[PDB]
Every structure is written in structure tokens, then in C-alpha cells.
A paper describes a structure:
Here we have determined by cryo-electron microscopy (cryo-EM) structures of the head and tail components of YSD1, a phage infecting Salmonella Typhi. We investigated the structure of the recently characterised phage YSD1 as an example of flagellotropic χ-like phages and more generally phages with long, non-contractile tails. Samples of YSD1 imaged by EM showed characteristic features of siphoviruses: an icosahedral capsid and a flexible tail tube of ~220 nm in length. Cryo-EM analysis of YSD1 allowed structure determination of the head and tail components at resolutions of 3.8 Å and 3.5 Å, respectively, and the generation of de novo models for the major capsid (YSD1_17), auxiliary protein (YSD1_16) and tail-tube protein (YSD1_22).
YSD1 has an icosahedral head organised with a T = 7 laevo symmetry. The mature head contains 415 major capsid proteins arranged in hexon and penton capsomers, forming a shell that is remarkably thin for its ~650 Å diameter. This shell is further decorated by trimers of the auxiliary protein located at each threefold or pseudo threefold position. First, a clamp formed by two loops, C1 and C2 immobilises the E-loop around the threefold axes. Second, trimers of the auxiliary protein dock at the threefold axes over the clamp and E-loop locking in place this critical capsomer interface. In both YSD1 and λ, the N-terminus of the auxiliary protein staples neighbouring capsomers by interactions around the twofold axis augmenting the major capsid β-sheet of the E-loop/N-terminal arm. However, in the flagellotropic χ-like phages, an additional hook-like structure formed by an N-terminal extension connects trimers of the auxiliary proteins. This interaction mediates the formation of an external protein network that braces the inner capsid shell.
Residue numbers in the entry:
A (entry chain C), B (entry chain B): 2 to 51
The structure:
Amino acid sequence: AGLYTTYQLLEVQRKLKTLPAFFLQWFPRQINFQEDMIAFDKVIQDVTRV
Amino acid sequence: AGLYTTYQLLEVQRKLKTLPAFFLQWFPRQINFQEDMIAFDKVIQDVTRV
């Protein structure tokens, strides 16, 4: 004391919230492209006929 | 873009319908005959009589 109260310091309590990955388990593939759009093709192939 | 866009194509999504063999599993014997017809004989012998 006197001019100023003396202190001891203890360890700093650092909480660190995260947002852990859950829905990215269903998105396995990473495909990069330097192009404008991404197109797909869906094709239904009717086979089961006598 | 400009005149028209560019495209990165991913894999073709092929919906394909089959009809797997459930009834053929009781028909094991295969006969590749060149003749006309196929003759069977069935014989029932009644013995259980007094």
C-alpha cells in the first residue's frame, strides 16, 4: 500500500467460443473454378420395361 | 460473361432404375434346347388303400 496497492497476478482466463463444423460432414468435395457459372446435368434413364 | 457466360461442368447425375432378380432365385436350372417342345411326365401312385 501507500502510493499504490500492490497486487499479485494470477493466470488469465481466456474463453474462446467457436462454431464447430457439423453440416460440412455432408459436403466432402472441394471444386475450384476460375469461370463464370457452374452447370449440371441430371439424366433420368428409364430402363425397367418388359 | 460479356456476350455469354462460361461454365465449369461437374459430373453427370445419372438416375438409373433397375429391376433386380427376386423371382429368378427359385429357377436354377438352365436348358438351352434346339428342339421344339419339352416333355414332362407326372405319375401318381395311390397305395394308401385298405
